[PDB]
Amino acid sequence: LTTFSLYTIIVLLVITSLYTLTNNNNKIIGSRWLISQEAIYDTIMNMTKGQIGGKNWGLYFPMIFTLFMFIFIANLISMIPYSFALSAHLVFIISLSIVIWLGNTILGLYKHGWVFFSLFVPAGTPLPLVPLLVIIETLSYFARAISLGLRLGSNILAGHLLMVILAGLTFNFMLINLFTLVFGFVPLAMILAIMMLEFAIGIIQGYVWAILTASYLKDAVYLH
Amino acid sequence: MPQLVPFYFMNQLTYGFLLMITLLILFSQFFLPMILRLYVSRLFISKL
Amino acid sequence: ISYAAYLNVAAQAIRSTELQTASVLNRSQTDAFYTQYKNASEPTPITK
Amino acid sequence: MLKRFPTPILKVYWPFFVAGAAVYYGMSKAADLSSNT
Amino acid sequence: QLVLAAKYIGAGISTIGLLGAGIGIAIVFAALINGVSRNPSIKDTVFPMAILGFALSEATGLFCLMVSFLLLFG
Amino acid sequence: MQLVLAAKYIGAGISTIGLLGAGIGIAIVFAALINGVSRNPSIKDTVFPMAILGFALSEATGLFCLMVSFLLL
Amino acid sequence: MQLVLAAKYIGAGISTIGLLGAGIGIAIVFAALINGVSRNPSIKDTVFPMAILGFALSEATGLFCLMVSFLLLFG
Amino acid sequence: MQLVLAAKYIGAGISTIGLLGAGIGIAIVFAALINGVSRNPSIKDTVFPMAILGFALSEATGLFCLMVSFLLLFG
Amino acid sequence: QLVLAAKYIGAGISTIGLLGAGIGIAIVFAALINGVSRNPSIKDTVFPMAILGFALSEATGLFCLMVSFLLLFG
Amino acid sequence: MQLVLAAKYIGAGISTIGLLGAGIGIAIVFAALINGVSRNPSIKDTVFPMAILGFALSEATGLFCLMVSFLLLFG
Amino acid sequence: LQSTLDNIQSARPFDELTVDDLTKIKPEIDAKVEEMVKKGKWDVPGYKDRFGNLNVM
Amino acid sequence: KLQFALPHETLYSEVTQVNLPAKSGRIGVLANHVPTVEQLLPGVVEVMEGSNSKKFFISGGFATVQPDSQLCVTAIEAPLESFSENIKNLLAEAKKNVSSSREAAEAAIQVEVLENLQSV
Amino acid sequence: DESILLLTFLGFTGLVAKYLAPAYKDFADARMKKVSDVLNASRNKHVEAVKD
């Protein structure tokens, strides 16, 4: 088993603990900790009902929920100082994006036939640009394929690598003459702030993924 | 490419898709209905 | 507060320096009690 | 609670799963191609 | 070998074109939020118009991206 | 050889910069559309033809840049 | 060679310039959100999702520029 | 060698340009905060956390750019 | 030496990063002045927020400057 | 040696570009003052301390840039 | 009615009592849960009208 | 041609420049001005007909340049000289009123009036 | 290098225990209370109905 595999097991066990014994006694009012994952439940309920509302909304709610929760946990766990970055293996995140994009294309073809490509005929316009708006709509349609993945990957990777570069630099900042030990707090404070910011952009990315691939799924489920 | 050109791409991707299927099933069959149980139990008390 | 109520209160205040006419002061002092009328019926004659 | 409740995720999420299998195979061939680079 | 050096340089320069489209995308979406707050109820009609404008603005950036790839990959 | 072909690649890269202007441009027309339409409501049916014209013209400047890029490629 | 490795490093630097347009873009969407919310008050329930959509796409064009930088530099 | 070492320094510099866009970005968010609070007198309880969110996203592009600057300078 | 030339040229290029902060700060102060001239009495809350915004805008510029010094001195 | 002196004078030119941002900035602060005064002249005295503060702060970023310029040119 | 009044008085759950026990006293719970899962709706109407929703929209 | 009027009496209902305080800041009307509607805020108003200037203190109302270049100013009551210390004492009392509390709005309006008075 | 990250994470946990953990206590408490109060209210309500 690889380093990546070992940390995927660790992520799975973290997620298991968040419901298995986060709810003590299966209390009616429920333990205070489960109130957090209740609020998460409600804001993704109202988001994917907000997006892909309709008869099939709750039929895609487990999928949109594990797309929140995977990215939400994996951009907190990966932010631990000595923990192996699964997400810094871009190939899992980019593959998941392509899979969902292809799984939108297949769903679209299945659900809406060969008139699936009428999704890429947007609306009435004067006739010399009716075909044009199909070409540079389809160009944008498989720009949707990679965009969703490349957002999350770039942000998370750049955060960890930035932090490590500054951390190594402040190490060598504190290995020069003793006057640097005095008032060497300003670069340390920058690293503290960067670590604080990285939790934020990880939760922001975890929500933004699951809404954006609700927007693509909105297009696929309901043509226009 | 600090680990972005291994040959272990398929190793990574295999364990990756295994984790997704596990979490999908796990949420859907176990834990999501345990939240929906809280909602419904609360609503049953509300109705009662 | 109502926009015209806002202007009204301001006008009443604005007659305060002072040199002012009785008619101004009379114009700035109300003399009524609005009788709210329910459906026949009538909630209390609150001083307008 | 932690009772296994049936969810119809085996036919709703069929186009997603078809895409997963295709990428799985394609990455096998891609991994073999990248290991010669 | 000048050609190979240039291939990498040329790719970099191509990247510059994209910035304008990024600004453009924001300009359409700014109008969307502004408009919706201005009318209230315009939103259902306006949202398709907006998506069209987004796609078109985006497409200019896509052209720039393609030229980057054309140099880079060859 | 090496230098001239190299120079073509350089020139092509530079040409993308011209496109950026069109990118901002298309958006400005569309932004106006959303603002205008939210302001009037009812103008939209008359205005939408005008908007298409504006889109096309903005794009056209970009097309000139684009074809120069293609020539150099 | 020296020339080729240099050309990669220089080319990467040029690519990084692209991010600026998206950076300003993202702020414009959030500004519109704050502006809209202060004008309406109550619209926010609808408008916040709309803003999140606008954020994502504006961000993505910059990130495309970033990815070219990464590709040249790391590769 | 000398050319490669030079290319590190130059590459960092080019990357430093991109930061300017994020600087403007933050300012736009705060401008909207001021403007909004000035419009409503009272939007602020909602709008202040909303503004901090806007700040964080606009800032982030600059920081990615800054990373590339450090990668080029330091290696 | 080419390395010596490179640090001087590079120092120049890095200085350009400051430009954005210079525009930025003025927009914050402009908005402060516009806001306060509209309200009058908003200023008690708003002036602290304006100084916060100023500091953050300037902070980005200091990163530019720190890179500039890393080139120039280093 | 000639390379060093060349780089110094070229480099001096490059830094000077940064000043443009402040040049727009000063105008923006003064424009705000003029508009504020015209929209209400009674606020003017409350605004006046903030106005001088804003002018200085806008100019200052340009002066940071200018110190780098002089470090290259004279130093 | 006396007996029921006494039963609510002598055992009033309003904090705890297992929700599994609420399922045990009412399989109506599982009937509704199963029907909701079968329906593919995870909105519970009535829940929202007397328990708020945490939302960021 | 200015039409300045109060229900109490007409004032000007020829006049060259009129300077008005509006929710759109301050508006000055000079000859042809594009036809507007403006909420008049509690105000100090200056009317100049030729170079002769008459100064009015105005309790807010509505202002409307009509498309026939007729500046309808309507307000509840007014001269500046007529309005022009004891009121400052009253306004102090009004600050006291804010402590307990329509009364809240009233006391707030009294503060607005204090500003309007301070302008004098 | 990485010991700098552990110091920052420790600092982060210090800020959390100062700010977030009581804030989240108050948030959690508020919700917990609201739910509990609804439950006991319905129980009270239902005792009334028997008497009615």
Residue numbers in the entry:
A (entry chain T): 26 to 249
B (entry chain Z): 1 to 48
C (entry chain I): 8 to 23, 27 to 49, 53 to 61
D (entry chain Y): 1 to 37
E (entry chain 6), I (entry chain 3): 2 to 75
F (entry chain 7): 1 to 73
G (entry chain 5), H (entry chain 4), J (entry chain 2): 1 to 75
K (entry chain V): 117 to 173
Paper text:
ATP synthases use a transmembrane electrochemical proton motive force (pmf) to generate adenosine triphosphate (ATP) from adenosine diphosphate (ADP) and inorganic phosphate (Pi). ATP synthases are macromolecular machines consisting of an ATP-hydrolysis-driven F1 motor and a proton-translocation-driven FO motor. The F1 and FO motors oppose each other’s action on a shared rotor subcomplex and are held stationary relative to each other by a peripheral stalk. In Saccharomyces cerevisiae, the FO region contains subunits a, e, f, g, i/j, k, 8, part of subunit b, and the c10-ring of the rotor, while the F1 region includes a trimer of catalytic subunit αβ pairs and subunits γ, δ, and ε from the rotor.
